[PDB]
Amino acid sequence: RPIIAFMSDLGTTDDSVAQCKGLMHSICPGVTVVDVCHSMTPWDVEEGARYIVDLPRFFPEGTVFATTTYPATGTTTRSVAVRIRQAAWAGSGDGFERADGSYIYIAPNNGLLTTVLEEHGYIEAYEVTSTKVIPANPEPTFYSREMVAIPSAHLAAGFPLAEVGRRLDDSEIVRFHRPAVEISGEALSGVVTAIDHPFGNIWTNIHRTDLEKAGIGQGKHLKIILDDVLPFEAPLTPTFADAGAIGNIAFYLNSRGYLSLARNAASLAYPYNLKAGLKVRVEAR
Amino acid sequence: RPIIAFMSDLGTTDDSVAQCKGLMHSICPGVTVVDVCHSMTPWDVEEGARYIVDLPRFFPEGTVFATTTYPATGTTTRSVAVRIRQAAWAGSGDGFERADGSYIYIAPNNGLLTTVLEEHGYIEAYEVTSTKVIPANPEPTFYSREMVAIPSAHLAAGFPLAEVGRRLDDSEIVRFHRPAVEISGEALSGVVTAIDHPFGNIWTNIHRTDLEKAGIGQGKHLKIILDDVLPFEAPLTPTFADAGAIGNIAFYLNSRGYLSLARNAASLAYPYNLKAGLKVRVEAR
Amino acid sequence: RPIIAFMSDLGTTDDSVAQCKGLMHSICPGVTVVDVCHSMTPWDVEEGARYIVDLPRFFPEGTVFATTTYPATGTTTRSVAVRIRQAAWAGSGDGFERADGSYIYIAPNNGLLTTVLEEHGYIEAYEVTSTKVIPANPEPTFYSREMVAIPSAHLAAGFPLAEVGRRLDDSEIVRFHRPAVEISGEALSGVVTAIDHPFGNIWTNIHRTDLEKAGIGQGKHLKIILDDVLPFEAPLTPTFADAGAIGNIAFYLNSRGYLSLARNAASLAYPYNLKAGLKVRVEAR
Amino acid sequence: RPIIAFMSDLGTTDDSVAQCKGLMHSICPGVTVVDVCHSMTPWDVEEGARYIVDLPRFFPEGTVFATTTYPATGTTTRSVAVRIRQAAKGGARGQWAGSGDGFERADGSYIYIAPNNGLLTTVLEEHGYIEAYEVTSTKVIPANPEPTFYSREMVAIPSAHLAAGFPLAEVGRRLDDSEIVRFHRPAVEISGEALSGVVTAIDHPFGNIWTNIHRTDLEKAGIGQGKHLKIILDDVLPFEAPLTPTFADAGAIGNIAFYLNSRGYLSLARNAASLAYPYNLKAGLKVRVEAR
Amino acid sequence: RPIIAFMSDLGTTDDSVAQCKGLMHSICPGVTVVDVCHSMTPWDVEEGARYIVDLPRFFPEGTVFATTTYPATGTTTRSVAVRIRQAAKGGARGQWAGSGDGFERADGSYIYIAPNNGLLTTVLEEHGYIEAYEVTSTKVIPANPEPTFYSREMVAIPSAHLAAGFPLAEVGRRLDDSEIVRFHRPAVEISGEALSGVVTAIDHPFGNIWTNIHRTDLEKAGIGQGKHLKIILDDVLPFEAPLTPTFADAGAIGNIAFYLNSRGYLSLARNAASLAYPYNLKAGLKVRVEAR
Amino acid sequence: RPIIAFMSDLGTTDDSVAQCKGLMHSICPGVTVVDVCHSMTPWDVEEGARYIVDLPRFFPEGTVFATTTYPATGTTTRSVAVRIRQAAKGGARGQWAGSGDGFERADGSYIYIAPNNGLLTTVLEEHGYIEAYEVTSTKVIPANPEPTFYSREMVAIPSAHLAAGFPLAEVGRRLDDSEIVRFHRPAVEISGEALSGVVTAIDHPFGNIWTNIHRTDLEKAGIGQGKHLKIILDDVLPFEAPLTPTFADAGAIGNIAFYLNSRGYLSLARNAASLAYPYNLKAGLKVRVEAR
Ligand SMILES: Nc1ncnc2c1ncn2[C@@H]1O[C@H](CO)[C@@H](O)[C@H]1O
Ligand SMILES: Nc1ncnc2c1ncn2[C@@H]1O[C@H](CO)[C@@H](O)[C@H]1O
Ligand SMILES: Nc1ncnc2c1ncn2[C@@H]1O[C@H](CO)[C@@H](O)[C@H]1O
Ligand SMILES: Nc1ncnc2c1ncn2[C@@H]1O[C@H](CO)[C@@H](O)[C@H]1O
Ligand SMILES: Nc1ncnc2c1ncn2[C@@H]1O[C@H](CO)[C@@H](O)[C@H]1O
Ligand SMILES: Nc1ncnc2c1ncn2[C@@H]1O[C@H](CO)[C@@H](O)[C@H]1O
Ligand code: MET
Ligand code: MET
Numbered sequence A, B, C: 001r002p003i004i005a006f007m008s009d010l011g012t013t014d015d016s017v018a019q020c021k022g023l024m025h026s027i028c029p030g031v032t033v034v035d036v037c038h039s040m041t042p043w044d045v046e047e048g049a050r051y052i053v054d055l056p057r058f059f060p061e062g063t064v065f066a067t068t069t070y071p072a073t074g075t076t077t078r079s080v081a082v083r084i085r086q087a088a089w090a091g092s093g094d095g096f097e098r099a100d101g102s103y104i105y106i107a108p109n110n111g112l113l114t115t116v117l118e119e120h121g122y123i124e125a126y127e128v129t130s131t132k133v134i135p136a137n138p139e140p141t142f143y144s145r146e147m148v149a150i151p152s153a154h155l156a157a158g159f160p161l162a163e164v165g166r167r168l169d170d171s172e173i174v175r176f177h178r179p180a181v182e183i184s185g186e187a188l189s190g191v192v193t194a195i196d197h198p199f200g201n202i203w204t205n206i207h208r209t210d211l212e213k214a215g216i217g218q219g220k221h222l223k224i225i226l227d228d229v230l231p232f233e234a235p236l237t238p239t240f241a242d243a244g245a246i247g248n249i250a251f252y253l254n255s256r257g258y259l260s261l262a263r264n265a266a267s268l269a270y271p272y273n274l275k276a277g278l279k280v281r282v283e284a285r
Numbered sequence D, E, F: 001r002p003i004i005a006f007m008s009d010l011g012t013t014d015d016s017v018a019q020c021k022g023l024m025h026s027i028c029p030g031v032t033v034v035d036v037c038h039s040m041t042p043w044d045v046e047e048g049a050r051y052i053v054d055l056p057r058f059f060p061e062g063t064v065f066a067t068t069t070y071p072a073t074g075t076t077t078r079s080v081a082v083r084i085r086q087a088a089k090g091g092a093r094g095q096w097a098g099s100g101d102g103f104e105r106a107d108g109s110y111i112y113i114a115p116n117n118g119l120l121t122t123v124l125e126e127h128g129y130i131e132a133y134e135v136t137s138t139k140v141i142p143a144n145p146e147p148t149f150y151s152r153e154m155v156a157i158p159s160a161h162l163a164a165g166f167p168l169a170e171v172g173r174r175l176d177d178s179e180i181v182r183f184h185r186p187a188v189e190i191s192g193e194a195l196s197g198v199v200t201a202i203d204h205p206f207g208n209i210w211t212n213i214h215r216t217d218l219e220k221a222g223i224g225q226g227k228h229l230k231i232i233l234d235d236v237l238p239f240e241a242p243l244t245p246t247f248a249d250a251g252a253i254g255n256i257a258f259y260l261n262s263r264g265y266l267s268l269a270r271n272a273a274s275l276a277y278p279y280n281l282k283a284g285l286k287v288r289v290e291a292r
């Protein structure tokens, strides 16, 4: 039962995604295509990375991840196809253990896989050039279809990964550089990485382990200032309801393990026009 | 061929729904996940109820409905899993008769299933606590995944419903209270329950049976006033085209059996900024 | 492995599409429903046509296309079901050749299939009236479900096309009339047919063959004026990156073969409030 | 104590109006410049016309009206300056303005000066005029006018000379009536028990709705105070109310009121609430009026 | 050289204000009409009140304040005209306005005329008054007032007669204090180290935030210049800053400042940046003040 | 008949401007306060500068310009008051304003008073000045200025004393030229057949586009009336048109026009249509000009 999990910037308003799915079913009969999302901000490689970095442990072994925003479409660039190592457990009971090397990502070689590779490691990476799995005459503006969707379907059908093209050195895989959290005492500086739609919760790049280094744990009183102006105060709690009344401010670690801000069953970011990229300062005593 | 029909407030812009689907396929290989919608207004239990109340007759028997907006995520609350009684026919010819007790809903116990239970009745309801079908260590902020998606997949795989947890008394199932239509002569008062996106038609809580009690039938001339200010007049007709010219006002019973307002092949609500919650007054003579 | 590719104006915010899919699975067990899109501008038959005209070559033979915007819902009108001739190749290598007569469209008879029929031709067309494949008592406002979704599933299950109703003459199939490109020297006049969401690229009705007639080929310097006011200049290039710096203007043939405008990895239409329908004038020397 | 009442499309965000006023004071020391408004939709002469046609009876005799939207600035066109005949009564009833029984205004006692582009159409129609002149004399306009600023050069500057007592007939040659540009207004159509017209304006900042159906139109149709009416907008919104003097007659806050506005025309509104703004109702919607 | 200071809800987009001014000049030749503002939210008497309560000390004695939002226009209601007692000192400190030590204003030297609908509540509260009269004499209002335009008929027109020297006591009968409509304002609540109040206004066009906590409230709570404060908005935004004279005392551009505004009330802002606009902060948010 | 021309960032929605005017009349009875505009973007001194630099030639000699955006209000800063030298000619051609050949203005005949924060940069640059003084005397400012309201305390109030004839040199000590704060403006870059600059302003309410390329810049580049030009905005929109006197020279309504604006700078627009608004074109876009 092959599965392709599909994340793109192709949108939800025309036939772009369906063209890809038709070909996926053409190449791999009985494939199941699971949509991640197709509404990421176009060409925002760091935003796309967030939508795909923690997928593996949720999916059956052998799942292929087709992940793409392709602003360099039509150029001599070629996609990269990678077998990751550690799935890094979700599910009922104690969850579902996944064996190493059980997932393949295929994407533009433009940094999209940066955090996937950082968190999971990888066993082998190849550039995708073989006309066995890509068109001999690719549509210049549609590499998300030609260089990702189509070869992802061959990989799901069991095309041997090592035959898609030559093996890449680690230096040939493009990566983006994320801003580091800055820690001084129990005072941390970071950024808003995302507005958690559709709730308007606010996600930061400050991880649980950053909090731990600052001696911040559950129940610690925090002050969080956004963009050096807008202040919030709350204890660190497991979840939204811990803020008490509807509308109250909660500080919590999100399901990804990162410090987040929210109103309890109300939207925090939207009424204040808050967006990703704002500076975050965290203070505890 | 097991089917899970999935309705959530999780949105369409990140990997939340895909995490659920991966696990559903992990737990129930060969399951088909049919998306209802994932864009309901967060925490609006009455809006969610509308999207799920009339699903059963459309689906093959044995379908599991995973339906969730979970503002109490992370608390000691537990989901409820319910086998409904009457499917309450759709399809070609005279439609498809569905046997009693053929569908299971699983949802937060927060009133989401209120109208499902009212229209279909139910045979048996259980709280979902067994670590055979939920995580032993659930992600606090993600009960829509942990307490709905994951156990819905076990139920679809044939996990016995009565083993998910203890059986609930009817008093333990939370319900919301809907405002009643008020009837005086052939004058009715109700509310706008929904803007019918993407058309901008206007749906009210005034049912066919309310109209019947007021002696209002097909062709009756009506005056409908919204929010005690904005007036419309038309005869009650079966459909949009019966208004005549494009843009003309039609009054009709929607596919759910409720009195609705529309412009013929044009949007009524959007140009006038009309939204759910407005008072509705209906007058006939 | 039957496939229905589903394009509608039913939206993504309620249970409308799921009601259709439930019935499709009810009628054709093991069917795969592939969503094209459901967010087309309601009742815009020319916009819908664009989303479905080039689908066939992407899909396995035997695929049924269920395509619908149905403003005449509830009237005596009946859908048309058509076996097209030429699929008109996509895929790896030299692509996937599709045999003639391998696809069926079913749609309102309201012009939606106009360009499908123009580009592919057709072998046979029927009105859909048999209560073997439509309801004996159709919901007046829901013909997209009753007259398209339901019979599309019977066709996918192998219901013989010629038995859905009587065979239509070509004169009985409604068509819309598209505005023609006007060519004078190497000066062309057309219109913006679409904003290419989510990128904000601008698509025109000026085809590669129109450019060829004007002696315009790759590298030719063009001036394009929108709405007789807003000017742009660039050489014709294969793709976005050929504009050079991020934000620079590119002129290119889109994946459909039509002259298009874009900023390189930035949105052209949105900052300038540009929308479909604007006049397009093209000048070369 | 001369007065220039100044209506333009120059806006309120830069020094354009002040340049005009500086010059008005330079030419007519002691002048008072009374702003009408400066926010009209640029180049909409029919909107501009509504802001100036009712002014004369409110002002002291001798007042000069400098009124201008000038899209033909810098061309060979020249402004028209005109002495009107009747100051004219106005309002829901038709009366002189002021305390007591109001202030009767003498004939021939106001001058309008404007681009000759139709801006004065309803001024001339409602007030009549004695003689009209094109404005060409370099005694009252620049010898070398700023091409893009005729609202200053050909309206503000000569209006101040006129306010200072410069003889109107010496601004340039007399115009024939046929040389005066006019726009054409939609007529009200009248059946016995009914009337059709149009929304002419949203009454800012309240959101009241003004139509072109005049008191005299109502009278011809046998409609007077207290008459139960239906007023349908856009053939889709059938409002019902009696014709009343004012908003509060509708009773509760928010209730629909039908009334003659302060210009003498049938209008709709909500009592101390905005009718047009919540529902995006705008000028140009068709109006049907029916006696019930 | 009489002055009428004119505050209305008539807006700045049509000829309504000019009609009023034309009549003011007709009645009081030589008058100067000083616009206060005309953009107040229609029918919001508490907002209108804030625009007029601090005016007297800024104007020459004899100045008449014509202040009006008139949703009851055209009813049997009549305007109130009143001679106030104390011009009153104001500001962050409480002083006379002007150069040097400021200009002391004599008592009984300003008249307000307004709809009797509560608009003058804080004027009367802060200044006191000698006598109040309903405005009924057709010496100073029309015999047949335009029903929808009492702001012109019952405020503008009589204000000009008063400016011209018409005796206040002859405008109509004396009112008892109980006949003067008043609105009720939220009181500041005071604990020893803390205070609760409300945002009364966003200070346009800067986006500063004004509260109802007055200097005298701070003094009662032992809070003076330099005191470290917390000001929490909407029980969700806990701003912290010392109380300072002005914006630049916050240091860097964009930093939060707490200060007494020019009306004497505790306010919050950013130094040469907008506080309220980027975050959609609006009047009505709860305020909690704490000494730190 | 003294005049104060008043430009501020105080806005048009509350009583701030009226407080200033009340005081101006208190100090200079008989003064006329001519509003320039009050809607400038707060604290944008370069925008404020554009609203005041062209004023002098339009006003009678002796006119005082009170011009203020004051983000440093309440600090030790003091306003600068200055007698300018040349009133200066202006416009597309460079001429005196007014009828006939215009009104020549004497030197040394206007005073500007402003925060010393660069607001007067282009005023001083284009007009020159005789002497500049810091404003400190309590004869003309309050002994105890309202900390947040220096636009009133340190500009409005002393401007009225100056209008009343108070000797400029007695407002405080003479400043050295180096003590006058200035902002720095982008220079136009000139190649033989081409020029680069910037959009300085959108011309509201029309949506015309103003650049910093001056008539004298065009002359240096050999560009005169009728010259076929290309003007590229943001290196993405290559407009083409001949240089013409005015908008209507473009022919049909909506056609692109290139012209020298009333301030003397190269501008782009559509003939009786808005260029900038439909496409969200704003100040700050780069400009390239090419002779064709
Ligand atoms: N204007 C554009 N500039 C650069 N890349 C684009 C543009 N429009 C679409 N694309 C890219 O083309 C890809 C499809 O091949 C999409 O994933 C998208 O990132
Ligand atoms: N700010 C919030 N307050 C309460 N519940 C939330 C919030 N954000 C997301 N959730 C809920 O968490 C659920 C996922 O477990 C979603 O269904 C959603 O209802
Ligand atoms: N107001 C309306 N007027 C005409 N058709 C409509 C309207 N609302 C929905 N529909 C149509 O009903 C169809 C469903 O049967 C949709 O495809 C849609 O086109
Ligand atoms: N782009 C434009 N096209 C035509 N006329 C204009 C334009 N911009 C301003 N004007 C006109 O110039 C006049 C000033 O002379 C204004 O009254 C205005 O109507
Ligand atoms: N729709 C309305 N309802 C009540 N009062 C109104 C309305 N429109 C304008 N007014 C009032 O009429 C006054 C003029 O007499 C204005 O001050 C204003 O407050
Ligand atoms: N938040 C603020 N920061 C700095 N200056 C301000 C602020 N609000 C108003 N001002 C200034 O105060 C002046 C009045 O003294 C105004 O001209 C204005 O520029
Ligand atoms: C991504 S834009 C170019 C590729 C294709 N035409 C599409 O719209 O998806
Ligand atoms: C619903 S918010 C918390 C759960 C998860 N992080 C999500 O975004 O869906």
Ligand code: MET
Binding pocket: B196, B199, B201, B254, B255, B256, C010, C016, C141, C142
């Ligand atoms: C398309 S509107 C009428 C059909 C159905 N009620 C729906 O909302 O889709």
Ligand code: MET
Binding pocket: D010, D014, D015, D016, D148, D149, F203, F206, F261, F262, F263
């Ligand atoms: C309307 S163009 C003439 C006015 C002047 N050019 C300005 O706006 O500054």
Ligand code: MET
Binding pocket: D203, D206, D261, D262, D263, E010, E014, E015, E016, E148, E149
């Ligand atoms: C506020 S209604 C009175 C004013 C007048 N009717 C107008 O707006 O023209």
Ligand code: MET
Binding pocket: E203, E206, E261, E262, E263, F010, F014, F015, F016, F148, F149
């Ligand atoms: C710009 S702050 C000084 C003005 C005054 N505080 C006001 O806005 O009322």
